């Protein structure tokens, strides 16, 4: 990793992150065969099997009722990202819901627990059967529940049953609580064996396969599931796994803290508002303004392209002489000088103005330095901690090349506009001169 | 559903949603009888029963420690909605916590599992007894734990006991992990049978009853639970179910995307800020800026009236006269053109400006059209997908009627204000002319 401290705007750009960006969805249609359960009844009295059976049958009868229904950029992007994801999944479920499709899916899963199927709407879904509970209900429990009078002395039957149905009950709990669309793929929707199998079936390049098989916790976290319905005594649901159709492109993250300066003892501040993740996608700079969008593992940042806002390729001039770029770099500005620490990956920005006492220290030495007032950049090699009055921040002990891009801060070099002096999220040349 | 593209402000209004607005709370007070458990001790050694017994007795002892503690309109509204709900619930629990009223509740539940009770503070709470654990502990377990021996060969009772107490232990986790106020009504606080009873007991019109019995997942979502405490060996807690005292009134949702124009080659944009849900309530337009509260099922939009801000009835002029109206329609305006898709219910708004290449296509045909730059409105009938450079958005294949309300966009027809050009959340006439 690299981290250029941009002195003139009290902001770091951290660079050399690589990219993984979701660009499509891959569908696995699970058929969890709940079994023959509604042909079995316990009618003698209270019993262990009856209680598990009643839960299983009641959960199935419940699940039949559950169904799905089928500028400050951050609030925009995370609005679009969720709406796009659900609409893309729903549009596929609305094909699978057709009885002419369910019966095809079910038929190819007659002979095998895994099938690849093309829906009539063209999507080449994978299909999977989950079948352990059907096998138990058919081979064991039907034979044991006998002429009702299921209060048999065999308790291995009852304890066994409470194990096999447990997945099914968890799938019901999750879809019912979420009204048919789970936010993430639990181990109950898709076990690790099924996720690894589904990844290995995706129509993708081997690099994505290896990367996804390593990061399968991320694949599970980006995907989500939709309940198709209950057909016969199979619950059918689909899991949308991500497809990471852009990988390995450059990304960087911009962090900033208030660059204040005092004129006749009045402070003037600006803050860069263009903070957050940026990546190059297919020869376009793309900005991911919402903090849910992107997540890091190592150098790889896992963003979602539906959240990205395209920004002009000139916008990187906000990272090199923003003081003279013609691009409208978004800043806030105003009087009140917040003093704060912004933790970057390879260090900390420390905004420290009139008032608070800022210092940096090491666990081995104590106070190394009293920081000058004004924005300072503290590499994670200069110190182990930064303090802002009594508050202490531990720094990230991470290796990488810090850099300083020197320059007299903008707020120290332009006069603020007399009125309005406080302006929120404005092009910089409205704050100064 | 109906949807008008308001051409002059790049915003849709979608109409024909029907209100279902929560206006009060119905209390169900549950006496979950944990039973005689504190008179049972296993003292021979490790045993199955002892482990379940110790979990029960420990959880009960833990539960006794638990008790409850007692313009950017979105941040305002959702705060008020949260605070009002808890205060309305707590004000009733402070009645029931009086021993003079627990003892009445408990007494009316002596020979019936369901009782309707009036508190001394006048609220007609429903009251419910849960007894399944007490019945087991009294008739089965107390009889088996002879003389503190309980390494007993009747493994049915150990396995059976771990079924009966599971509700109790789940209730204890949910209250303890939330310090006495759950965010929602789990199946462990209130089972499906008890919710169906509670809905059927509400003092409400049959239209509400039928509607609530159908949408009971939503009733479960809007309600919440408060722990009233442990009295003897009953935990007492209450579930505040919603009362939907406004239904069937008109609602609509406004969506917008940046309407920009290159007046003198540089852009000027505005964005409508008055986005989100509106409903007519009792002859007043009410605006629901919280994205958390309003939630559609079919045509019904479920909202909380405590989250609503009343807006003048003239405010609908922003959907006809925004260029000409004298109501202060809130917009943001400024230089930088975001290009983005806003997915409406029946289509997509597609903001596509200098830079990105936007196209619409169908799975059957590929690219149908290259979109003109400027805001465009794409019905879900024109295409299955919209793209913004490499990004693809699937459209909602939902039948409905789409309209265009024509007019030259405001930002193309009025000259921007020269300073400050970028203004956030301002009345429209501060941006233009």
């Amino acid at each position, epitope marked *: 990793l690299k981290e250029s401290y941009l002195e003139e705007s009290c902001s770091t750009i951290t660079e050399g992150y*690589l990219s993984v960006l979701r660009t*499509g969805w891959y569908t696995n249609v699970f058929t969890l065969e709940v079994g023959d359960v509604e042909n079995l009844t316990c009618a003698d009295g209270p019993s262990l099997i009856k209680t598990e059976l009643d839960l299983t049958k009641s959960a199935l009868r419940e699940l039949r009722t559950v169904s799905a229904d089928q500028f400050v950029l951050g609030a925009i992007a995370c609005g679009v990202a969720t709406a796009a994801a659900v609409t893309a999944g729903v549009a596929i479920a609305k094909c699978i819901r057709l009885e002419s499709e369910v019966t095809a899916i079910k038929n190819c899963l007659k002979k095998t627990n895994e099938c690849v199927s093309t829906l009539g709407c063209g999507v080449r879904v994978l299909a999977t059967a989950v079948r352990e509970l059907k096998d138990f209900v058919s081979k064991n429990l039907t034979r044991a529940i006998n002429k009702n009078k299921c209060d048999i002395p065999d308790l291995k039957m009852a304890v066994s049953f409470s194990q096999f149905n447990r997945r099914f009950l968890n799938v019901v709990r999750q879809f019912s609580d979420n009204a048919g669309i789970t936010p993430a793929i639990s181990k109950d929707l898709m076990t690790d064996a099924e996720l690894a199998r589904a990844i290995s079936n995706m*129509p993708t*390049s081997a*690099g994505q396969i290896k990367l996804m098989l390593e990061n399968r916790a991320m694949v599970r976290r980006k995907g989500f599931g939709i309940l198709i319905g209950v057909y016969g005594s199979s619950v059918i649901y689909m899991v949308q796994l991500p497809i990471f159709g852009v990988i*390995d*492109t450059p990304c960087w993250i911009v962090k900033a803290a208030p660059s204040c300066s005092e004129k006749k003892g009045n402070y003037a501040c600006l803050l860069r508002e263009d903070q957050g993740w940026y990546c*190059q996608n297919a*020869g376009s700079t793309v900005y991911y303004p919402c903090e849910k969008d992107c997540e890091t593992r190592g150098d790889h940042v896992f963003c979602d*392209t539906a959240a990205g806002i395209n920004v002009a390729e000139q916008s990187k001039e906000c990272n090199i002489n923003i003081s003279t770029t013609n691009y409208p770099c978004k800043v806030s500005c105003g009087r009140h000088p917040i003093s704060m620490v912004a933790l970057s990956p390879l260090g900390a920005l420390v905004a420290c103005y009139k008032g608070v006492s800022c210092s940096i220290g090491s666990n081995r030495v104590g106070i190394i330095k009293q920081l000058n007032k004004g924005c300072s950049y503290i590499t994670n090699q200069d110190a182990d901690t930064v303090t802002i009055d009594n508050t202490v921040y531990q720094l990230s002990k991470v290796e990488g090349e810090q850099h300083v891009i020197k320059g007299r801060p903008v707020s120290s070099s332009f006069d603020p506009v007399k009125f309005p002096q406080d302006q929120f999220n404005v092009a910089l040349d409205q704050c100064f001169e | 559903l109906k949807e008008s593209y308001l051409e002059e402000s790049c915003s849709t209004i979608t109409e024909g949603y029907l209100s279902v607005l929560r206006t009060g709370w119905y209390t169900n007070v549950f006496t979950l009888e944990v039973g005689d458990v504190e008179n049972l001790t296993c003292a021979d050694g490790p045993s199955l029963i002892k482990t379940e017994l110790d979990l029960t007795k420990s959880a009960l002892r833990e539960l006794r420690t638990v008790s409850a503690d007692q313009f950017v309109l979105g941040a305002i509204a959702c705060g008020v909605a949260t605070a009002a709900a808890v205060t309305a619930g707590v004000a009733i629990a402070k009645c029931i916590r009086l021993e003079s009223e627990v003892t009445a509740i408990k007494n009316c539940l002596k020979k019936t599992n369901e009782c309707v009770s009036t508190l001394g503070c006048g609220v007609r709470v429903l009251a419910t007894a849960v007894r399944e654990l007490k019945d087991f502990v009294s008739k089965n377990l107390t009889r088996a734990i002879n003389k503190n021996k309980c390494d007993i060969p009747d493994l049915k009772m150990a396995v059976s006991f771990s079924q009966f107490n599971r509700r109790f232990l789940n209730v204890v986790r949910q209250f303890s992990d939330n310090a006495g106020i759950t965010p929602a009504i789990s199946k462990d606080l209130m089972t499906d049978a008890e919710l169906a009873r509670a809905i059927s007991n509400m003092p409400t019109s049959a239209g509400q009853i039928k509607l609530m019995l159908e949408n009971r997942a939503m009733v479960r979502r809007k309600g919440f639970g408060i722990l009233i405490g442990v009295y003897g060996s009953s935990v007492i807690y209450m579930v505040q179910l919603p009362i939907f005292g406004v239904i069937d009134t008109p609602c609509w949702i406004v969506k917008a995307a940046p309407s920009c124009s290159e007046k003198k080659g540089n852009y000027a944009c505005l964005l409508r800020e008055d986005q989100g849900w509106y409903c007519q309530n009792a002859g007043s337009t009410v605006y629901y800026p919280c994205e958390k509260d309003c939630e559609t099922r079919g045509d019904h939009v479920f909202c909380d009236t405590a989250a609503g801000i009343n807006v003048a009835e003239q405010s609908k002029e922003c959907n006809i006269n925004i260029s000409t109206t004298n109501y202060p329609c809130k917009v943001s305006c400024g230089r930088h053109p975001i290009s983005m898709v806003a997915l409406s219910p029946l289509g997509a708004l597609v903001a596509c400006y200098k830079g990105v290449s936007c196209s619409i296509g169908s799975n059957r045909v590929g690219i149908i059209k290259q979109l003109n730059k400027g805001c465009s409105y794409i019905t879900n009938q024109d295409a299955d997908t919209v793209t913004i450079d490499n990004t693809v958005y699937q459209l909602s294949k939902v039948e409905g009627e789409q309209h265009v309300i024509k007019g030259r966009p405001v930002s193309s027809s009025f000259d921007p204000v020269k300073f400050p050009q970028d203004q956030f959340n301002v009345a429209l006439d501060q941006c233009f002319e």
Partner: nanobody
Amino acid sequence: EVQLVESGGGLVKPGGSLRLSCAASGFTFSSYSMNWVRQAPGKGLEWVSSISASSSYSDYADSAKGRFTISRDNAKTSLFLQMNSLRAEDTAIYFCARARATGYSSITPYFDIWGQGTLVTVSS
């Protein structure tokens, strides 16, 4: 203009070595995967190798594995193919191509911009 320009193709004796170079210009070269494709005279196109946008992944056809080595310099905006042990059957026009994909359905890349290709002759 968005242009790729191959160079370094020429005559090589079998068993010789060569290094094709494809200068890229007019686009954000560090954003795109890059490929080499070849065409034996009058035959169909054969894909040869590919490199990811930051060189983290490299792929080769079975004919190219071990014999070739693709590399890129994102600062020089230049793409290279080292070639070794050139067989007579490696006589072909070699094109570099910019490679691009939409992840929506599947990740199969396609070659939107091609260079005009450099002729490599492998003969006595």
